[PDB]
Design a protein around this ligand. Structure first.
Ligand SMILES: CCCCCCCCCCCCCCCCCC(=O)OC[C@H](COP(=O)([O-])OCC(O)COP(=O)([O-])OC[C@@H](COC(=O)CCCCCCCCCCCCCCCCC)OC(=O)CCCCCCCCCCCCCCCCC)OC(=O)CCCCCCCCCCCCCCCCC
Ligand SMILES: CCCCCCCCCCCCCCCCCC(=O)OC[C@H](COP(=O)([O-])OCC(O)COP(=O)([O-])OC[C@@H](COC(=O)CCCCCCCCCCCCCCCCC)OC(=O)CCCCCCCCCCCCCCCCC)OC(=O)CCCCCCCCCCCCCCCCC
Ligand SMILES: CCCCCCCCCCCCCCCCCC(=O)OC[C@H](COP(=O)([O-])OCC(O)COP(=O)([O-])OC[C@@H](COC(=O)CCCCCCCCCCCCCCCCC)OC(=O)CCCCCCCCCCCCCCCCC)OC(=O)CCCCCCCCCCCCCCCCC
Ligand SMILES: CCCCCCCCCCCCCCCCCC(=O)OC[C@H](COP(=O)(O)OCCN)OC(=O)CCCCCCCCCCCCCCCCC
Ligand SMILES: CCCCCCCCCCCCCCCCCC(=O)OC[C@H](COP(=O)(O)OCCN)OC(=O)CCCCCCCCCCCCCCCCC
Ligand code: HEM
Ligand code: HEM
Ligand code: HEM
Ligand SMILES: [Zn+2]
Lengths: 487, 294, 32, 455, 74, 116, 49
């Protein structure tokens, strides 16, 4: 009388699903003998072997550093100047960026058209960019053709010629570039956050500067800026790939001679008008935008602060989450799990920025207008949890992730050269991989708690928000969420 | 937002209604202190309820024992004079605060649409306060107590056809004796809870239609959460009120009353000056001014 | 995490005992 | 605790001795597992190892039943298996600190994983598990299908990929015509058991290559043989067929500009190494740009199209010239994005350029030299980034059964000449025009009107 | 012209001007006080604690015994 | 111990009584698992096929209707009833195992019960 | 007040039933179907009282 499971399509479906479940119930050890999802430390000392980065200091004060690997076939040669938009004078804000744009063009013999023709004829690339307090002009080239690239860099950095018609054309181009940046909302958010956090300080002003100032260059400001800030002690030449240190040193010595001898040293320049964090907020409500993008930030650590590594670990254990992330609801960080499980945000990203004598540390969320209060609760909860109740497995996972991220990012010739120059400018030396790993391994739960108490516990925050933000909690909400009354 | 795992306790269902209506209720950003007066009236009601309960732990509703029982509370009970002075002067401050509440409403025309229901429930609340304070003032059973009860109950005879019947039924026995005393004690104990219910309905209707502001304009542009912004303002109001009420309790406790209520009720003689408490005086003046008691 | 948790619980217990003594000052119990 | 302020070396470290400054150039070892599988590796100096598993499967092997399995499989790459759950897999990857990626193309598709050189057994074991033993659960497949439907709903934002797919579908018939982005009907039809059957039928040993970038060959083979040697030996069913004859695809969308693209056949394919190299050099000569970039010299601003069109014709949003080469076939052509009113003139200009390269004498020796040097530079600067090295190993072994040494590509690019360029352009222009248009297409010329040229 | 609320969006400045009619701004370099405030709040908080203890004890001891009873204890 | 009706007369009688009751109301033993009860049953039902879950809802509605009407299933369908033909225990066990693993190593609960 | 909180919690999760099973498939409004049932209960209680 009772029907068999063959009939009753629901009985058939139940049988099929039960068969599949009983299929996947028995694991296998030969595919599980190495997994160990619980994180643990390891000593990669047997692996961290890289060629020595030879450093030389020409007596005019010029540092040249190379990491040669003569088995390769390409190379990257560049100049890393310790100057940027921070070192302006409140009326020449856009000078650094505009000088970049101009210095691409022409010299007493380069003739921008035929200069770019030469660059593209040898097959290489030539790029540049300016940060708040760092400037880079680098070129990627091949073996036996490095010297031409080095000569071109020296020529453009020393004997550049600025002509009025090209200056007008670049004024037009930079006004267009300013008009296209507001589409990129993340950069706008971070510019506003910098302005409202380091207000009344040289770090507050943007990189591009104001259009009213870009319209009044006249090339006298350009020449004055280059002669006052591109001095010999503040520059570093870096090379990787198939290069020879002695050849590079000889070429730099023979070429970089018409420099700007001066005394404006960035250390003394930062001694005056330092960077001062001021807790505040700016919130630009629109309600015509589909997504609300905001960022909260605490005061960070300087480049040389020994707690910078701890802050890097902490921003690794608040790792970024994305709506197309592979992990999804399963991730190491508690903040990513909270965001993904309850789907309260389109994407979150924790950032750690380091400057001289200051820095930043935040979470950069981007969500929908209705989940903002829950998202803010999640962010503040996880940060103050880092203050109070950090866990050993989380710390170990964060340290492993940080080591892996750094060593995987250093990949190629241009990344190696960029690492050499940036580290030489920030610390005065290039930190070896073994020492970097030792410093990271010196971070444990007690270290994380101490650093978070130093930087997060009951400290002012700076908020920058844009879009439909009616539901975003006010300043007092975040300010009170920076501590727990339970402990 | 799908609430898979719980973020905050305040958004949990146990504290969700409380969260909304106490912490997260949007409020006009430009409110002055008279909204604090409304909250202060609520606090005065709670104070009255608590002190009244602890007083009723010692009061005997009999005609032969009420006055001496109150003197018991003043002299023998440990810190009983504080309880009695708090109850009496708290009735006075309750009426002061409610009057300031009402007059702010009149000044800013808060009775206008869409808060007609709020104003009407307020009028009902005021009626309940009047009745409660009157029947409570009958309780100590002094000269003013007994004679005010007599007069105010006997003016109910003005009803055309059923006036005398209502007067006799409310009196319970041709006078204002022991039966009326017990009746009034029970009613005085009962009414404050109906007053609490009326206050809750008052607040619910207001919360439906938001809250007015000193400008009288639409105010959904700039609104802030009630906590902590208006909790601290209300706290300043509460502390100032506490100082005022402490001035009244400890240094001038019998100024807001009449000395005839310290004489035991004697229905034979009549005190020369029969007036209600100071907060019924405007109504008494209107009624006395227009002659022909009907 | 357990040492921190028990330390915090003990601190809250000390605070609770202090509040209890403040509410009910008992030299009768304090002396012995 | 005290720390040395990070501008001073940290106390006592056991930092090791550096590499010998031009140690050597590692060779690729390839071992053929007797069931028919390939395991290849090479040594790298950097502390990072990239390990990938590449399969000869994709849209070409799709069937009317599946029709979308490749895209879904890319989305369902590192999900729960019969031995580990999805949570366990993600926790393992995070624990060692590596990155997982999946790529799905028309002809072949791969799964790659990156981590430090210490974790080689973990990398290879997790990869082999996730490929060989997948458990396509209905709920996980449904989640990924929902995401894929949303992505299909957000497709028009990039007209270039849409036009590439359109050109392939229009100008091919069966195999290469099989779509890559899983239309909505196919998405609704797709299912977990369908994925299971497709994988079990296609993911077989004689079409699997495991390529490592920075891993010792002995270690890799010693950890991979106990995980792949027992796969069944199958007879490697033949590759699908596809003919080129094809015409026009036209789709109307928003009012912002029109995107027109043209393409041709060049039937050499990757097995015709000389023609593939000549096609790459021709692409690097043609190239172009988007007229909105502000990077700097070297990005091809002196290419022929860039110079002529962009420096001469304005109101043309972007102008590029591209190629796509599959085993035994090719597809080279020009992408144009311009204003709706200008579109017929834009088509005329693109045809003029494509015929200009064909006729002899119109390409200068200096331009050819620049193109050859740029191609050599692009290849060389691409073979850094060990991820690219491992991918190249895998793709080359899948295609040719070996790794063709870089010197062959360099020599071919060296020996290409103007006569070769002209002959290849003449051959490529003879094949029937393939045309696609997207946007305000109600004003672009007819396919036959455009095809009046080129013949 | 520029609607003057997108000008502020497009032009972030390091010199931000607040109202300063009800509250004078500290000069930028000065630190956040954050301590004077908590100590003022603490003084008020233990004033409140004193008040609450007073009220509670008044109520409970009122509900406690009475002087006439204690007299009749004999 | 593990006491099954084959090796225990008391267990045999217990199973017989349960079969009689469930057959009277015509609903499988797994249908008694309340999704609001555990929230693991909620997930297991979310993972099951729609045909199976719809059959469960139909059987439950039939049982509730019979309960209201104060009657039992007619003897035909009562003889056609198949209690203890489970459809949920395997999925529930899988869900609980996954939750146990996630809790055991790190991890936040994928779902939680509101208060209350 | 406690009775009102009691009823509020129950209404949060809904009432049980004799079978003890999930019962969001077959449900009816309170009035009038259970009003009359409770009326019968009240009148019987009134006779008892
Ligand atoms: C009673 C209603 C509230 C119950 C508790 C809910 C709660 O979490 O409150 C804190 C909670 C903090 O916000 P949250 O979003 O839960 O964030 C929690 C933090 O992550 C973490 O917050 P936390 O851990 O610092 O605070 C938890 C709090 C929880 O309270 C207790 O455990 C007690 O514990 C204490 O405060 C310990 C005090 C011991 C003495 O809410 C408030 O502080 C708001 C209270 C508003 C009261 C309004 C009164 C208006 C009166 C008008 C007349
Ligand atoms: C007992 C009756 C008073 C109880 C306390 C009332 C209260 O909360 O007053 C707060 C009230 C201030 O409240 P608010 O939140 O500043 O704004 C309320 C009005 O907008 C404040 O408007 P305003 O400042 O233009 O009003 C002028 C001032 C009184 O101004 C004058 O008397 C002007 C001089 C007239 C004679 C020449 O008003 C008052 O003092 C309050 C109304 C007194 C009746 O008055 C004070 O605090 C007194 C000092 C000012
Ligand atoms: C549960 C507890 C935790 C919680 O969630 O609290 C909720 C909520 C906020 O707690 P939270 O967000 O964790 O903490 C934020 C503040 O730190 C919370 O700190 P706060 O400063 O807001 O709290 C101050 C609190 C601190 O309390 C204590 O220290 C105790 O003191 C009071 O609330 C004082 C209330 C007003 C007393 C003054 C008199 C009022 C008028 C009645 C006068 C009656 C006497 C008449 C004259 C008699 C003359 C003898 O607390 C309140 O709403 C209070
Ligand atoms: C008068 C009616 C009851 C007053 C309190 C109340 O309304 O909520 C109690 C709560 C009911 O749950 P509720 O918040 O209505 O659930 C979803 C509503 N958005 O029921 C609860 O779960 C908690 C009940 C305790 C209420 C104390 C406050
Ligand atoms: C010790 C008790 C051991 C019980 C072992 C299982 C018995 C199961 C069983 O069928 O018990 C018989 C009966 C209930 O079963 P049934 O006869 O179907 O009742 C409804 C129709 N008469 O009766 C019972 O189940 C009664 C059980 C009473 C247990 C009391 C324990 C103290
Ligand atoms: C038991 C005494 C009373 C209590 C506890 C009370 C309580 C409150 C509360 C809490 C509010 C909201 C907060 C505020 O706006 O101040 C309010 C508002 C209001 N009340 Fe009362 N109230 C009382 C008596 C009255 C009376 C007698 C009236 C007038 C008949 C009245 C009329 C109003 C009005 C009009 C508002 C609207 C406030 C506004 O417009 O902003 N209330 N009351
Ligand atoms: C349920 C709460 C209340 C109880 C149990 C209560 C109880 C009492 C008792 C027993 C007395 C007589 C004690 C005495 O003579 O001092 C009294 C007096 C009084 N009550 Fe209340 N009461 C309550 C609430 C209120 C409220 C809300 C008011 C209104 C403001 C009020 C107004 C009065 C007045 C005016 C007196 C006479 C004051 C006097 O003794 O001179 N009571 N109450
Ligand atoms: C003042 C006395 C009480 C009143 C007025 C009261 C009122 C109610 C009401 C109106 C309901 C909803 C109707 C119903 O389900 O019967 C209910 C349900 C309920 N009450 Fe009470 N109750 C009281 C005492 C208790 C006590 C003492 C308990 C147990 C400690 C209790 C436990 C329950 C339970 C468990 C339900 C849920 C009924 C269900 O299964 O659907 N009640 N109560
Ligand atoms: Zn620029």
């Amino acid at each position: 009388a009772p029907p068999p499971p063959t009939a009753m399509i629901y009985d058939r479906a139940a049988e099929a699903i039960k068969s599949k479940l009983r299929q996947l119930e028995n694991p296998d050890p030969r595919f599980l003998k190495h997994g160990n999802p619980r994180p643990a430390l390891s000593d990669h000392t047997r692996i961290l072997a890289a060629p020595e980065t030879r450093v030389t200091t020409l007596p005019n004060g010029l540092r040249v550093a190379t990491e040669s690997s003569l088995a390769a076939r390409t190379a990257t040669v560049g100049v890393w100047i310790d100057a940027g938009s921070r070192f302006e004078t409140e009326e020449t804000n856009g000078t650094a960026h505009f000088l970049e744009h101009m210095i691409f063009k022409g010299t007493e013999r380069r003739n921008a058209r035929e200069l770019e023709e030469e660059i593209e004829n040898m097959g290489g690339h030539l790029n540049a960019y300016t940060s708040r307090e760092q400037t880079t002009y680098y070129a990627k080239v091949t073996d036996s053709d490095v010297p031409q690239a080095l000569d071109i860099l020296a020529d453009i950095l020393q004997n550049s010629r600025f002509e009025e018609n090209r200056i007008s054309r670049e004024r037009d181009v930079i006004l267009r570039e300013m008009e296209e940046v507001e589409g990129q909302t993340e950069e706008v958010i971070f510019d506003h956050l910098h302005a409202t956090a380091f207000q009344y300080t040289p770090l507050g002003r943007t990189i591009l500067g104001p259009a009213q100032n870009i319209k009044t260059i006249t090339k006298a400001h350009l020449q004055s800026y280059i002669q006052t800030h591109y001095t010999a002690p503040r520059m570093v030449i870096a090379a990787s790939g198939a290069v020879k240190h002695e050849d590079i040193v000889e070429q730099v010595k023979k070429l970089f001679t018409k420099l700007s001898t001066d005394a404006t040293t960035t250390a003394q320049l930062v001694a005056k008008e330092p960077a001062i964090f001021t807790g505040s907020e700016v919130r630009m409500l629109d309600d015509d935008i589909p997504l609300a993008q905001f960022a909260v930030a605490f005061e960070g650590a300087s480049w040389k602060d020994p707690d910078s590594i701890a802050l890097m670990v902490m921003q690794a254990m608040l790792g970024s989450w994305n709506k197309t992330a592979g992990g999804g609801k399963h991730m190491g960080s508690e903040l990513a799990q909270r965001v993904g499980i309850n789907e309260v945000a389109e994407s979150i990203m924790a950032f750690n920025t380091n400057y001289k004598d200051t820095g930043l540390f935040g979470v950069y969320a981007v969500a929908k207008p209705d989940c903002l209060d829950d998202l803010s609760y999640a962010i503040m909860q996880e940060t103050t949890k880092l203050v109070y109740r950090v866990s050993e497995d989380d710390v170990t996972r964060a340290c492993n992730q940080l080591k892996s991220s750094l060593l995987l990012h250093i990949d190629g010739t241009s990344p190696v050269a960029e690492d050499i120059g940036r580290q030489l400018l920030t610390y005065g030396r290039r930190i070896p991989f073994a020492e970097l790993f030792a410093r990271i391994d010196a971070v444990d739960a007690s270290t994380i708690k101490r650093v978070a108490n130093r930087f997060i516990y009951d400290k002012d925050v700076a908020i920058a928000a844009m879009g439909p933000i009616q539901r975003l909690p006010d300043y007092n909400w975040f300010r009170r969420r920076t501590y727990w009354n339970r402990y | 937002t799908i609430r898979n795992q719980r973020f905050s306790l305040l958004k949990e269902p146990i504290s969700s209604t409380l969260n909304q209506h106490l912490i997260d209720y949007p409020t006009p950003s430009n409110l002055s202190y008279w909204w604090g007066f409304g909250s202060l009236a609520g606090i005065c009601l709670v104070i009255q309820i608590v002190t009244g309960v602890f007083l009723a732990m010692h009061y005997t509703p009999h005609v032969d024992l009420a006055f001496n029982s109150v003197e018991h509370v003043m002299r023998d009970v440990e810190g009983g004079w504080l309880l009695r002075y708090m109850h009496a002067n708290g009735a006075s401050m309750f009426f002061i605060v409610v009057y300031l509440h009402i007059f702010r409403g009149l000044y800013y025309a808060s009775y206008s649409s869409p808060r007609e229901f709020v104003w009407c429930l307020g009028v009902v609340i005021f009626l309940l306060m009047i009745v409660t304070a009157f029947t409570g003032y009958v309780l100590p059973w002094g000269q003013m107590s007994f004679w005010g009860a007599t007069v105010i109950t006997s003016l109910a005879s003005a009803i055309p056809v059923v006036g005398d019947t209502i007067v006799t039924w409310l009196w319970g026995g041709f006078s204002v004796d022991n039966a009326t005393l017990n009746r009034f004690f029970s009613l005085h104990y009962l009414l404050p809870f109906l007053l609490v219910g009326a206050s809750l309905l008052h607040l619910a209707a207001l919360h439906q239609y938001g809250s007015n502001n000193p400008l009288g304009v639409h105010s959904e542009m700039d609104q802030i959460s009630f906590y902590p912004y208006f909790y601290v303002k209300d706290l300043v109001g509460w502390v100032a009120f506490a100082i005022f009420f402490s001035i009244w309790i400890f240094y001038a406790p019998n100024v807001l009353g009449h000395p005839d209520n310290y004489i035991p009720a004697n229905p034979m003689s009549t005190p020369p000056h029969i007036v209600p408490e100071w907060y019924f005086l405007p109504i008494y003046a209107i009624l006395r001014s227009i002659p022909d008691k009907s | 995490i357990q040492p921190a948790d028990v330390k915090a619980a003990a601190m809250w217990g000390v605070a609770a005992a202090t509040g209890g003594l403040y509410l009910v000052q008992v030299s009768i119990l304090v002396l012995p | 605790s005290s720390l040395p302020s990070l501008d001073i070396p940290l106390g006592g470290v056991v930092l090791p001795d550096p590499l010998p400054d031009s140690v050597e150039q590692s060779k690729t070892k390839i071992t053929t597992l007797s069931n028919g599988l390939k395991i290849a590796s090479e040594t790298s100096p950097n502390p990072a190892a990239s390990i990938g598993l590449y399969l000869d499967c994709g849209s070409i092997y799709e069937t009317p039943f599946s029709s979308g399995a490749s895209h879904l499989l890319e989305r369902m790459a590192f999900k729960s298996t019969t031995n580990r759950s999805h949570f366990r897999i993600v926790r393992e990857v995070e624990a060692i600190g590596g990155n997982i990626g999946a790529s799905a193309s028309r002809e072949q598709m791969g799964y790659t994983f990156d981590a430090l050189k210490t974790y080689v057994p973990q990398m290879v074991e997790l990869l082999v598990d996730c490929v060989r033993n997948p458990a396509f659960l209905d709920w996980e497949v449904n989640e990924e299908l929902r995401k894929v439907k949303a992505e299909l709903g957000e497709l028009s934002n990039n007209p270039q990929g849409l036009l590439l797919e359109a050109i392939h579908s229009a100008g091919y018939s069966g195999a290469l015509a099989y779509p890559l982005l899983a239309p909505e009907a196919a998405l609704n039809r797709l299912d977990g058991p369908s994925l299971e059957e497709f994988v079990a039928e296609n993911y077989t040993a004689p079409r699997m290559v495991l390529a490592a970038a920075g891993v010792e060959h002995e270690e890799l083979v010693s950890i991979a043989e106990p995980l792949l040697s027992d796969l069944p030996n199958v007879p490697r069913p033949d590759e699908p067929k596809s003919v080129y004859v094809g015409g026009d695809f036209r789709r109307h969308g928003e009012s912002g500009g029109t995107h027109v693209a043209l393409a041709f056949e060049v039937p050499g394919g990757w097995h015709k190494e000389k023609d593939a190299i000549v096609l790459t050099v021709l692409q690097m000569l043609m190239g172009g740009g988007g007229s909105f970039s502000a990077g700097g010299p070297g990005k091809g601003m002196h290419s022929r199209l860039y110079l002529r069109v962009l420096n001469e014709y304005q109101q043309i949003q972007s102008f590029s010239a591209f190629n796509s080469i599959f085993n035994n076939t090719g597809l080279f052509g020009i992408y144009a994005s311009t204003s709706p009113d200008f579109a017929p003139k834009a088509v005329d200009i693109a045809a003029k350029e494509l015929i200009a390269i064909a006729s002899p004498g119109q390409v200068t020796q200096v331009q050819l030299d620049r193109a050859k040097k740029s191609t050599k530079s692009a290849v060389l600067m691409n073979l850094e980034s060990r991820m690219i090295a491992s991918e190249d190993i895998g793709r080359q072994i899948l295609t040719y059964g070996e790794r063709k040494p870089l010197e062959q590509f360099l020599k071919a690019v060296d020996e290409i000449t103007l006569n070769d360029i002209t002959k290849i352009s003449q051959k490529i222009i003879s094949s029937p025009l393939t045309m696609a248009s997207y946007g305000d297409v109600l004003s672009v010329p007819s396919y036959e009107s455009v095809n009046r040229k080129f013949h | 012209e520029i609607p003057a609320t997108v000008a502020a969006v497009k032009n972030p400045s390091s010199k931000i001007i607040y109202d300063e009619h009800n509250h004078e701004r500290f000069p930028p370099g000065d630190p956040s006080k954050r301590a004077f405030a908590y100590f003022v709040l603490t003084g008020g908080r233990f004033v409140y604690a004193s008040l609450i203890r007073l009220l509670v004890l008044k109520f409970v001891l009122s509900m406690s015994a009475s002087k006439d009873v204690l007299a009749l204890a004999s | 111990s593990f006491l099954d009706p084959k090796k225990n007369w008391l267990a045999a009688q217990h199973m017989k009584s349960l079969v009689k009751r469930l057959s009277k109301y015509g609903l499988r033993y797994d249908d008694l698992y309340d999704p609001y009860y555990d929230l693991d049953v909620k997930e297991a039902l979310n993972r099951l096929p729609k045909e199976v879950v719809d059959a469960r809802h139909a059987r439950l509605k039939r049982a509730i209707d019979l309960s209201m009407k104060h009657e039992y299933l007619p003897e035909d369908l009562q003889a056609m009833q198949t209690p203890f033909r489970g459809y949920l225990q395997d999925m529930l066990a899988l869900v609980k195992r996954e939750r146990a693993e996630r809790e055991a190593l790190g991890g936040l609960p994928l779902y939680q019960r509101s208060i209350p």
